[PDB]
């Protein structure tokens with residue numbers, strides 16, 4: 460029955476992927492961002508300039524007030540609101556209805572985006588990072604406890620405006636090719652993983668692998684970019700600059716601020732290297748790698764001019780809170796969040812990115828010694 464969830468995600472580039480949901484009785488329809496990087500289910504519940512619609516608790520006969528406030532600070536944006544519960548469904552999802560916690564967003568700062576088409580966020584990570592504390596059961600935990608939906612979901616995020624699939628409760632084999640390779644979930648709070656090696660165009664970055672996971676590495680469908688710790692970012696940018704030194708780019712391009720453009724269909728993809736991230740595997744001393752093409756980390760953006768020139772932004776930025784494998788990394792891969800077996804699987808997606816001489820890949824097995832030493836403490 461997973462076919463009913465294929466292509467249930469939509470979005471705008473750089474603005475997250477959302478799924479349609481209903482809350483309350485009678486059902487109120489809202490578009491909800493799917494976020495594996497947090498654990499709160501929250502919806503706009505008061506007028507806002509950028510909200511087309513919002514949750515009206517007064518119109519729901521199943522709404523229950525929890526008489527408790529809540530706020531969530533993300534990297535840049537934040538919101539605050541009122542906790543409560545209500546019945547929730549996913550129209551293009553499993554045929555079930557659950558009573559879930561909902562944060563009714565009453566005030567926000569740089570959270571909603573002008574013209575985004577979504578009105579809320581579904582944090583799919585674990586209770587340990589839920590606000591106000593881990594006693595607020597996340598949506599997916601409520602779904603698994605109250606229904607027979609198996610304890611796993613999978614995400615197929617597709618590039619170019621954009622679409623994808625969130626398969627709730629399983630793996631849809633028509634969404635990927637080749638084999639699924641699994642990496643352990645290190646700890647159940649974020650979807651934390653361990654990166655054991657990094658190569659750019661086949662060249663090992665030759666850093667202490669602890670640097671790749673300082674102070675954690677997570678899989679986060681709610682963050683656009685690949686975010687890298689300071690030392691790793693500097694090494695990666697230095698290598699990417701040298702590989703593409705054929706052309707010159709404004710220094711603001713490398714900061715993710717400015718954009719670069721080329722004549723329609725002349726982007727010099729060949730001068731940009733591939734990035735290989737090696738993840739800890741399931742057996743002793745075994746890893747696997749995922750290979751990232753420049754079509755993933757050069758995010759296409761609309762040019763505000765009359766030009767019909769392909770313009771892009773550098774979708775790799777510096778982090779001070781560890782590695783973030785964001786949406787641009789997940790795109791072109793089918794990613795299985797196998798909560799039941801505490802593992803995350805990667806396979807080449809049915810909507811993979813196309814280069815002419817290169818291809819995104821998930822390859823294994825590799826031998827990697829002392830992988831346990833790569834986790835930060």
Ligand SMILES: COc1cc2cc(n1)NCCCCc1cccc(c1)C[C@@H]([C@H](O)CNCc1cccc(C(C)C)c1)NC2=O
Pocket residue numbers: 473474475492494496497498531532533534535536570588679681682683684
């Ligand atoms: C830095 O650049 C960033 C940051 C974020 C998003 C993006 N770009 N682009 C995508 C924007 C799409 C929509 C969006 C807006 C606001 C918040 C989020 C999406 C979720 C948040 C994730 O939840 C973050 N996950 C990790 C994290 C970080 C801090 C605190 C917590 C707590 C709440 C658990 C969790 N995304 C971002 O903050």
